Structure formats: structure tokens, C-alpha cells
Design a protein around this ligand. Structure first.
Ligand SMILES: Nc1ncnc2c1ncn2[C@@H]1O[C@H](COP(=O)(O)OP(=O)(O)OP(O)(O)=S)[C@@H](O)[C@H]1O
Ligand SMILES: Nc1ncnc2c1ncn2[C@@H]1O[C@H](COP(=O)(O)OP(=O)(O)OP(O)(O)=S)[C@@H](O)[C@H]1O
Lengths: 189, 69, 24, 398, 127, 398, 127, 78
């Protein structure tokens, strides 16, 4: 009789699910028109045609994907924001993590963020995103775990890209799961 | 009055609508009397953040900017 | 065009009080 | 006394039950004449709303009770895991009375009166249930064991039981459920996961039991596989399968004993190698033995008048039953010869399993006679050669 | 106005079907057909299916015997697991709101029959 | 000496307790005089707020003890033990008498030594507890183990002990308790998910012991599910996790040894190949064999009495018992003829287990009697026939 | 006139349930007819015709098919009433046509258990 | 097995077609939904099922016990 160990994917897939998510949201949040409608994860995902931006995401997320794997991350926030780097659309992926159901309910996620353009009011185009990595340690403790990437550097919690406000949450999702408490919600301003 | 359209192919009286071209449901009414009855009604649960925006717990941030277009 | 069954797009009628006939 | 009458109502027939009862009672009282079955009727309503009427063991008596049934058309539903929906449980689910089960109770032939014992067992169960006897003081485990030689129709009798009980006891339970348990798909063996799997299928059994207006029959095939003999087996190398999967079923079945609308039916092959703590938790462990000479003759009859009914054996000769041969006293005569030759085949074809008995006409009409229409005594000769063909074929595979 | 509130209910029913993943066939895609920012079905069989179900409740809804439009999502046993109940007590502001509502209503939540017993959509769901 | 009386509160007998105490006192002073059971009274408060008054083991103008008790109709109240709601039911929870175990202590029939011992054990436990004996100079692990050939009823003994002791100790403790442990929902395939579940069970039980007014009986039905032998797990087949479970269980049983209101009841059949490090962790290891001749007679007498009362046997006859049979010197006569013939059935029914001895009054009316009524000597013969059928059905099944 | 035509359909359906002692002579529309005293049946047939009432407010209608069932509910008889819907003798003339129809023809078992249908003054019978 | 046999069943209900159907090398993976369909088409009649299993005695309960005549072919001939 064979008792046996396990092989978790727990903390990493999230951000790369965010990858799909962000590749979707960068599309849906109307902050990408260089996006193209494609097919992935059995949904009408809208991705980017630029392999250059694909590698930009490789740097931004897929370099920190095992670095984001620390469980200290509270709010993986896609701040959808103007030139001032302050949110209008706080896609707060409040990752309340209790450590294929993940895509079983991110089916609803991707699908409804896709529908979010029927909920998201007309956000002005020409506004970018920042990936605010809310950890359990304030003011960007342990620069190494955030600047893991050699070619891709990181910065501390400088006063501009550290704060957010105007938290009107219409919880477009509350999709609790087994591994994840993906309390995603779109806090409008 | 209650209007039980069994369909979508894969006191109070009941104005059910039959509308057949198949003649093989063999159960409209019990399923109609099933769709009619109220069942264990879960209360409307409420929403709330569990990780708020702490002023004493602050985020991380990477350096580079996206390719603008 | 329409037929009703006081027991073509058919508007049957049920009257839930009578419902002994297991297969209606 | 009492006699039982069962009448097939058509599915496309939808008349009320009491009209059917009145019409069949009218036909009976008009006719009021043994165990033969009606097929011919003389009333347009009764024709379009009945298929057949039958008497189950020539008398004008009126001690008549009517059981009316509907054999359900669709076959089995499937049962899979709750979150491991691929293959974990995969249990079979018959919603009795069912189509594929009719005629089954009639065809089977035994010589130890299993049918009556194993039917009046459930009858007395219901009697003791309705009379409110102290379940703390007189009790039954609701488990019936059947074991014996392979291919001798041991498991056939359980489906016949379930069909006959959901037919006989209609209007006392709207319907019956029959859950066929695959005792080979619940052995996902790595450190007591099968002993945890029995629990889920038994909770589903509980789900189908609490519907207190449905009589449920749980049919376990190869009850030797689920309950392996733990004590006498001097194999400590069995880590937790011989001790934590038999003990994981000896509890879930002692848990349904309190309920009353459940019956456990089990089919076994090996008398030994089964837990002694399960040969006490079975009310009836009845042995189904290989057919005996009179039984073989009766089965061969059933086959031959079946072929005549479908006109295979075109020239219809009266096949004389063994009782008529005893009455005449084995006197050779121009019609009595065929029954005699059948009876010689019966002694010569002794010791075979019922399944090969119900095959033998197939082969005897396969190789030896290609004729689309056959005269008797050549087909009989074809049987008398095909039986020796079966003996030699069995000897061929060593 | 009910001749377009029926199509608003069309919006509702297919968006519920869509977010619930009642089928894996991803037929649904954004459809502003005649400038309506709503995500209907691309099966004209089913668009006209909702059309004539609402057609045959049109001699039936505005007669006001209605006490709740219960769009049941049925089950494998054809069971009302999620009765999306809409109270009949009646300008895009509600529409997106209802859309919003539905979405935020599926927020807490995780084969449809349109039974007809502030558009206060509430979900009677199995516990 | 002391005689004990149990008085049963009906469902709506809410009034009080002391009034019933004094009322039964004047009842006993108006009577003053083997075990008896009152059910029909005269004084209106008695006839309304009392369902039964049993004097269970003459001049009663001596020391007498009362135990007012009221049965609770609650149910399972399962403990989920869910980590992410994916876990399964474990540790079903029974309460102050749940009316399901009522009447159990007297239906079970053993030798005399098996009940008095198992009762004065827990009595002396409290006697020593409240005299303040030194904890670590004379101590016990508070664990009882019952083993015997299967079918002899050793789960009923524990549940009836829980019932009897909850009632017998309603003054020292507010009310009783019982946790039946699901010894097959603790294991888990993954690595070191077993010992954590075992310690989670026992810490939950420890929480349930926090209050000192309850009395907790913890029933582990079949230990060998949990305390599997440690060395016998031979090469390679059994992993290490089959050792962590056993020693975690042993450590926990040692950790809840300090309290005085916990008793752990554990049973297992002739599969007494229990881990020695556990089979030493047991104050009382009692042997529960198969019923003896007198025990068989008493079971059959109770069965016949219940059957007559329930009107399956209409003509009631006064059946004697052994004490008068030895009083009359076994003189054959009309009154004892049926009694002696039942005794002769008993002398030839020696060998079976209790598990079937309480079926036979159901089989002998399920397989050998047709009318739903039958006289004694017309039913008791079918008892002999069913006995012989059970013996043969055992014998030929190897 | 649709209302009084519906009351004459009452007269029809139930007197044809007659055309045994549980029935009684009483004044309807100034003629004595031997029907049933049943108040449940009275208001039930009133309900049948008054649900037929909005149907005729539609004015789109073909027949009022008062199906006299057999006990099997599988018609061995029937009574289609194909009035092409757009003094006392003629309000009794219809009743005499149906009486002469059941005259040349024959009725059904005592409880005719009939279920009125409509297809949305003349008649015949599909026997 | 869903639409292929609906086509075949269209070819079975007629009395004119002697349809025989070959199965090769005997939802998805939580049953194959091939059994229920093939088992139900077994009933139509004039549709005879042949299965080139190519798998030896080791067999599942699903199809090898509803199959009645079973012949073995070994090495090919000269
Ligand atoms: N004794 C019998 N009398 C008449 N028919 C029989 C008899 N035994 C078997 N049959 C026929 O055998 C066919 C199937 O029998 P089975 O019950 O499957 O045998 P079985 O006992 O199941 O063997 P196992 O245990 O499953 S190998 C049925 O079609 C029966 O009609
Ligand atoms: N000595 C006895 N007197 C009366 N009944 C007995 C006796 N022994 C067993 N029984 C009857 O046995 C019936 C069931 O007993 P169980 O306790 O379920 O047996 P048991 O020992 O669990 O068996 P395991 O769990 O397999 S040892 C009870 O209802 C008892 O009546």
C-alpha cells in the first residue's frame, strides 16, 4: 500500500492565472487597440498579439512567479490608473489564501471579467496598470524577494505607487475556492 | 396563476403551457409542481473584504513600465 | 391554432388541486 | 386460500388504475375457469390498455387479488464519485419495475423451492413491520446470501426477486430501487482508500433509503471480494485491505438494519475465504445448485416450445411433460417417442451449468443443422450430438 | 414598454446561463445588435425561443396575475436549485444595474425553466 | 443492601422531580412488596406524569434508591471535522438517553458476571476519585476491551452500559454523553494526514470533557481498524504511517487518562490480534462467548412473550420458567409439556450466536407458517425446523 | 354575446353530462333542465367557461370541443362542437340537435369524466 | 457514438438494411457514454454488432459479458 506526498502549484499559478487574467483585463479594462480575440482555457479570452508584450509580462510576473510564491501577498492589485499612477479601477485580487477547481471557478472569473465591460462604465482609454503586491510586511521588506529577476529590477514602496483610495467595491466576484480565497473585486472610484 | 414552461431542449390555479411536438416528456406536472414549490431558501449572504487596505501593511512594486501604444 | 386541455402552440391547464393522474 | 393475478398495462395506455382493476375482475368473473396466462381479449378499451393477464401459483374460485405494474422503459442510471467523477464508484441503478427483467422470474427453474422461501421471507418481514414488534427484541439483518457453482444462475434469482417484489407489493410502495454494486471498482488500493470508498456509496444508499416510500434492494456481486477472510489468513503482509475494508462494510450494513424498506441481496462463489463475521449477518444463505435431471428436462422443454412458438420447429408435435410420461408409464408410441428421446438427452446431459444448458440449442442449431426451418427428431438429434460436442470441447481446454 | 422589457428578461436569462456555465459550449460572445450592450445567445433558435416564451406570457404577464417571474435554473433531476426570482413591479440605468445586480448577485453564489408565479432579483439557492 | 427503581418521565411530564420522588415513595409504602414493572397506577398525577416504574436488581421497608429519568428524542448531530468542507462524517454523537437505546440493558442476556463487574468497575472508579487517592501510586487508564466470537453482541453491551450508567448516576453528574468514533474516517491517503486527524479527534473529545458535569463514554467499535498490530506489518506492503496512527492513538489515550469522567469502551471479535502496547492499555478485557443453555431459554422465552403480546400468536399460554421446572422436579404434565419441549429445543440449539437467536422467531414464521396467526406447539415446532435448517445451512457451506 | 354563449356552453357541457339520480330539475335560462345540483361542479364549469371567456375576448376561435371521454380518458367517444364563432325554441334547438345525436348514437358509462377543450351554432360527433 | 449512432439508428428502423457495425480495438473518462448508446442500439434489431477487440482474456465487465460468441485467431497461415 502506497501512501504518498503532494506537489502543490499553490502560490505560483495565481499570478500566472493573473497573467491570463491580466492579459484578459488589460484587454477588458480597455487599457490595451492592440489586443486580439483568441482562445484559451475554453473561454473567449482576449490576449495580446505582441510577443514583445508577452515577454514584458514574462518579466513583470513570470519572473516574480516563484518570488510572489511567499503567501505573504495579501492584495494582488491591478491598479487601473491614469498618468498620476493612482487608481480609477482597483481590480483588487484580495488573495485571502487558505493554504482543476481553480480554473473551474476562474471560468466564472475570466467569463465575468469578460462580462465586466457590461458592468464597467466607459473607463477613459489611455491609462495603464500597476501590479501592487500587497505583502504582510510593510514598506517593501526584503528587496531580494521582489527584485529576484536580474535583468528586471524592483523598487521599494515609494510614496507614489504605495497608496490607493476611493474603495467603492461592487464585488463582481466573490469566488471562494479550495486553495484560493480569490476575493477579486472591482473597487471603482 | 403559475406558468410552468418545461422546455429549453438539451387557491391558485396553474396555467401550464404544453406546446408539444414530441409527446414524450412523461413528466410535465410533477416537475411543474416541483418548479412551483419553494425549497430550502438560503438567506442572502453579505459581502465584505477580509483583507482591507492597511496603512501599516504596505505593498511591493516592480520598476519597469509597459510598452506604450 | 391553439388548443387547451382543461384537465399548434398548446396552452394546457392543470388546476393543481386535482393532481391524482401521475402522468398528465 | 389466495391466488395472485398480474396484468401487463401498456405504457401508451393511461387509463386509471381502478378502471383496469374493474375490467380485469369483470373478465375473470365472466370466464372463471390452471396457471395459464390470458393474451386474447374482447374489449377495445381493454385491448388498447392491456398487454396480457397471468395467474401465478382451472378453478372458478374468487379469492383473487390484482397486482398491476409498469416495467420502466429506460435501463440503468450510473453512479460516479462526488468529486472524483471519473470512475470511483460506478454503481448501477435500476428503477424497478424494469423492462429488461420481465419473464426472468418464470424462466428460471430450480428444485429446492428457493422462490417460495425467499419470497415469503419478505412477506413475513412486512407482516412483522406493520404489527409494530419490538425491534429491540426480535430483529433481522435484512441480508440474504446465495452461493454455489459458477454459471448456475445464482445472481439471476436476485433480479427476479426484485422484479417480483416491486410487482407484488405495488400500491404499498410506489416503486422500488435496485442498486447493483460493483465489488471490483471499489479497490483503489493505496493505504485504505477503498475502505474509505465504501463509505461514500453507502451514504448514497442511505440517500436512496430515506425516501421512505420506495422499496430498495442492494445487490452485491462477488461478496467474497469485499469481505476477505481476515482471521485464518496467516498473511500479515495484507496491510489494511483485509482489516480496514471488511470492517468498513460490517458497519454500514449494521447501520441500515434499523430501517425496514431495504433488503440486501448478495451473490457469492467461494464458500470459504469469506469473513466468519459475515456468515452470521445474513438471514438466508441459500445454495443454488446445478440443474438436476427433471430440471434439465423442463429447461429443454422451455427452449423447444420457445422455438416452436417462433415457428423454428415448424411441424408442431405435442411435447409430453414428464408427468404424462409417468402417467402412461413409459410406453413407446408414435408421439411419445420424442419425449423419451428428450429424456435420454436429459440423463446424458447431466451435470452442466444452466448457462450452457440455455446455450445448447444455439449450437445444436448452429453447426449441425443450417436449415431455416427444421423438423423435430433431427433438431433433437442435433442436441444429442451437441451435448457430446460440449463435453469434448471442455475436455479440449484441459 | 413590455415589448422591450421582455428582451431585457432575455438579457437576464442568457446572462445567468452564461455566468453559471450551465453548458461548456462557449457560443456566447458580446453582441451589441441594435446598440444594446448585452451578451445574448448566438442561437437564433434560442433567441426566438425566449421570444415566443415571452410571446406566450404576453397575454399572461401584463394581465398582472404575476406574483414572481421565477427563472429557475433547473438541475439534472430538473430541480429548482437556483430560483432567480424577479418581482413584477415596474432608460438603461436599471438594465446595467440589473446586469450589475445579477453579477453581484452571482458574487456570493457559485437547464432553465421560466416559471411565472424595484426589480428585486433574489436567488433562492440550495444551502 | 439497596434495591433500585427507575421511573420514566413521559414526553410532557414537565411538572417537577421531588413530587414524583415522594409520590413513588407513598406508592412503595402502600405496596411494600423478583423484579417487577409497574405501568398502571391510580393517583392522577402518577398516571399522567409517569410511564413506567421498574424495580430492577421480599421486604422493601429498607434502603431504596430512585432514578427519575426522561428520554431525549435528539439525533446524530455529526461532527464534520472538515478542513475545507471536503471531510466526511466522523464521531457520531449520542446524548442523554435518546430513546433508541431504551430497554437495551435487559434484552441482552449474558452470564451474571458480565454485568455486575462492568458496573461496579465504574462505581469504584468514582469511589476512588472522590476519596482523593494519590494520582500516581494507584491509577488506571480508564479503558475496557470486549472480545468474543462474532455475533455475540458486544456493541449493544457498551451502548446499554452507557444507558444504564447515565441513569444510575443522575445525581453526581447532570447528564450523560457518548461519542462513537468513526475509526475509518481518521485515515487519509496523503502523508501524515492520519496522525493529525487522530489527534484532532482526541482534542475535540478533550474539549467535550472540559465541563465536569457531563459523563463521557467514548465507544471505539472495532479497534483493529485503528490500533493495527505494529510489528506484524511485514516487508514493504505496509508503510510507516501504519505505525504513527497506532502510537498517536496510544499517546492520546494516555493523555486523557487524567480525568475521572471519561470511560473508553472498545470491542473487537476473535480478531484479538491487537497491538500488545494497546492490549496492555486496558483495565478490563472481558470475554463475551456464545449464549449458554439458560441464556438461550431466556431469549426464546422473551421472544415468545413479546410475540404473544403483539398478537402474532393469538391464544396466550402461561409458559413456565426454569426456576419452577427445577421446583417441580421436571414432572411431565400439561402445563409444562410445551415448556419442556421448548427446553428440549434449547438443549439442541446450543452453539449459535445471539445474532441469530433473535432471528429464529422471525424465520420460523417466515418459512414454515403461512397463516398470519398460529398456536404455540404450532409455532414452536417451526422453531425446531428453523433451527435444523440453520444448522444444516451452516454445515454444507463449509 | 360571448358571455351568454359561454353560459350556453355551460348548459351544453353539463346537460350533455346528463344527455343518474344525482341529477335534478331546475330553471335555467327559462327552461327546466334535469342536471346536477353539485355546487362544486356548478362553479367548476362556470370556471371552465370563464377561463374560456378571455379566450373569446381574443375573438380568434374555431371550436368548443366538449370531449365526452370514456372512463379510460382515451376517447372511444367525443363531442366536437364546431361552432364557427366569428326566443326559446332555438336556444332549445341546439339541445334537441344534441339529443337527437345521442339518440341515433349512444352515450358512455355513467361518469363520463369529460375534459372540455377549445380550438382557438353547429356541431357533430366523432364516435 | 452519439451522432454516429443516431445516423446508424436512422439506418436501422427500416426493415431493408442489414446494418452491421464494427467497433475498433475495444462524457470522456467519467464513463465514455459509448456504452449506454451501443447498449440501447443493441435493441433495435437488424443491427448486428461486431467488435475487433484485439485484446486477450483480460477484459472489462462493460462489453465482454454482453458478448455471447467469442472466437480466437492466432498466428496467420503460410
Ligand atoms: N438453473 C437455471 N435454470 C434456468 N435457467 C438458468 C439457470 N441457471 C441459469 N440460468 C440462465 O443463466 C443465465 C444467466 O445466469 P447467471 O445468473 O448470470 O449465472 P450466475 O449464477 O450469475 O453466475 P455468476 O455467479 O454471476 S458466474 C440466465 O439467462 C438464466 O436464465
Ligand atoms: N446474549 C445475547 N442476548 C440477547 N441478544 C443478543 C445476545 N447476544 C447477541 N444478541 C443479539 O445480538 C443483536 C446484535 O448484536 P451486535 O451487537 O450487533 O453484535 P456485535 O457483537 O456487534 O457483533 P460484532 O459487532 O460483529 S462483535 C443484539 O440485538 C443482541 O440481541
Amino acid at each position: 500500500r502506497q501512501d504518498l506526498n503532494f506537489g502543490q502549484v499553490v502560490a505560483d499559478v495565481l499570478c500566472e492565472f493573473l497573467e491570463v487574467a491580466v492579459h484578459l483585463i488589460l484587454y477588458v479594462r480597455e487599457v490595451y487597440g492592440i489586443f486580439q480575440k483568441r482562445k484559451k482555457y475554453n473561454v473567449p479570452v482576449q490576449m495580446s498579439c505582441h510577443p514583445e508584450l508577452n515577454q514584458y509580462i514574462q518579466d513583470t510576473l513570470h519572473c516574480v512567479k516563484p518570488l510572489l510564491e511567499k503567501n505573504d501577498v495579501e492584495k494582488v492589485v491591478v491598479v487601473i490608473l491614469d498618468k498620476e499612477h493612482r487608481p480609477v479601477e482597483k481590480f483588487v485580487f484580495e488573495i485571502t489564501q487558505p493554504p482543476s477547481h481553480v480554473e473551474q471557478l476562474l471560468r466564472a472569473f475570466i467569463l465575468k471579467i469578460s462580462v465586466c465591460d457590461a458592468v464597467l462604465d466607459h473607463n477613459p482609454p489611455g491609462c495603464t496598470f500597476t501590479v501592487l503586491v500587497h505583502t504582510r510586511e510593510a514598506a517593501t521588506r526584503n528587496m531580494e524577494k521582489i527584485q529576484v529577476i536580474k535583468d528586471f529590477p524592483w523598487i521599494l514602496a515609494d510614496e507614489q505607487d504605495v497608496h490607493m483610495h476611493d474603495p467603492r467595491l461592487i464585488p463582481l466576484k466573490t469566488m471562494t475556492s479550495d486553495i484560493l480565497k480569490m476575493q477579486l473585486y472591482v473597487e471603482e472610484r | 396563476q403559475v406558468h410552468i414552461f418545461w422546455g429549453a431542449p438539451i387557491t391558485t390555479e396553474v396555467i401550464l403551457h404544453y406546446r408539444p411536438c414530441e409527446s414524450d416528456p412523461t413528466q410535465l406536472p410533477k416537475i411543474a409542481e416541483k418548479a412551483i414549490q419553494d425549497f430550502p431558501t438560503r438567506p442572502l449572504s453579505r459581502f465584505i473584504p477580509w483583507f482591507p487596505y492597511d496603512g501599516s501593511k504596505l505593498p511591493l512594486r516592480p520598476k519597469r513600465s509597459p510598452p506604450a501604444s | 391554432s391553439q388548443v387547451h386541455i382543461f384537465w399548434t402552440e398548446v396552452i394546457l391547464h392543470y388546476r393543481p388541486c386535482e393532481s391524482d393522474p401521475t402522468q398528465l | 386460500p389466495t391466488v395472485h393475478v398480474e396484468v401487463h398495462q401498456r405504457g401508451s395506455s393511461t387509463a386509471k388504475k381502478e378502471d383496469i382493476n374493474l375490467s380485469v375482475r369483470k373478465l375473470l368473473n365472466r370466464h372463471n375457469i390452471g396457471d395459464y396466462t390470458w393474451t386474447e381479449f374482447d374489449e377495445p378499451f381493454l385491448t388498447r390498455n392491456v398487454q396480457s393477464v397471468s395467474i401465478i401459483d382451472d378453478l372458478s374460485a374468487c379469492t383473487v387479488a390484482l397486482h398491476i405494474f409498469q416495467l420502466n422503459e429506460d435501463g440503468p442510471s450510473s453512479e460516479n464519485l462526488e468529486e472524483e467523477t471519473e470512475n470511483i464508484i460506478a454503481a448501477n441503478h435500476w428503477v424497478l419495475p424494469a423492462a429488461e427483467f420481465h419473464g426472468l422470474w418464470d424462466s428460471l427453474v430450480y428444485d429446492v423451492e428457493v422462490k417460495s422461501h425467499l419470497l415469503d421471507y419478505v412477506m413475513t418481514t412486512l407482516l412483522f413491520s406493520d404489527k409494530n414488534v419490538n425491534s429491540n427484541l426480535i430483529t433481522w439483518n435484512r441480508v440474504v446470501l446465495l452461493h454455489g457453482p459458477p454459471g448456475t444462475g445464482k445472481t439471476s434469482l436476485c433480479k427476479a426477486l426484485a422484479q417480483k417484489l416491486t410487482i407484488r407489493l405495488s400500491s404499498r410502495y410506489r416503486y422500488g430501487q435496485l442498486i447493483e454494486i460493483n465489488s471490483h471498482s471499489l479497490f483503489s488500493k493505496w493505504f485504505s482508500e477503498s475502505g474509505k470508498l465504501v463509505t461514500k456509496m453507502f451514504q448514497k444508499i442511505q440517500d436512496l433509503i430515506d425516501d421512505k416510500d420506495a422499496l430498495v434492494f442492494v445487490l452485491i456481486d462477488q461478496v467474497e471480494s469485499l469481505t476477505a477472510a481476515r482471521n485464518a489468513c496467516r498473511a500479515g503482509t495484507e496491510p489494511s485491505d483485509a482489516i480496514r475494508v471488511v470492517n468498513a462494510v460490517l458497519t454500514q450494513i449494521d447501520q441500515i438494519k434499523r430501517h425496514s424498506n431495504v433488503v440486501i441481496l448478495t451473490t457469492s462463489n467461494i464458500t470459504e475465504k469469506i469473513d466468519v463475521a459475515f456468515v452470521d449477518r445474513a438471514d438466508i444463505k441459500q445454495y443454488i445448485g446445478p440443474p438436476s435431471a427433471a430440471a434439465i428436462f423442463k429447461i429443454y422443454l422451455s427452449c423447444l416450445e420457445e422455438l416452436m412458438k417462433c415457428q423454428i420447429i415448424y411441424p408442431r408435435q405435442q411435447l409430453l411433460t414428464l408427468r404424462e410420461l409417468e402417467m402412461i408409464g413409459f410406453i413407446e408410441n408414435n408421439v411419445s417417442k420424442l419425449s423419451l428421446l428428450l429424456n435420454d438427452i436429459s440423463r446424458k446431459s447431466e451435470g452442466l451449468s444452466g448457462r450452457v444448458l440455455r446455450k445448447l440449442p444455439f449450437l445444436a442449431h448452429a453447426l449441425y443443422v443450417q436449415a431455416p426451418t427444421v423438423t423435430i427428431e433431427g433438431f433433437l438429434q442435433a442436441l444429442s450430438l451437441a451435448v457430446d460436442k460440449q463435453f469434448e470441447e471442455r475436455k479440449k481446454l484441459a
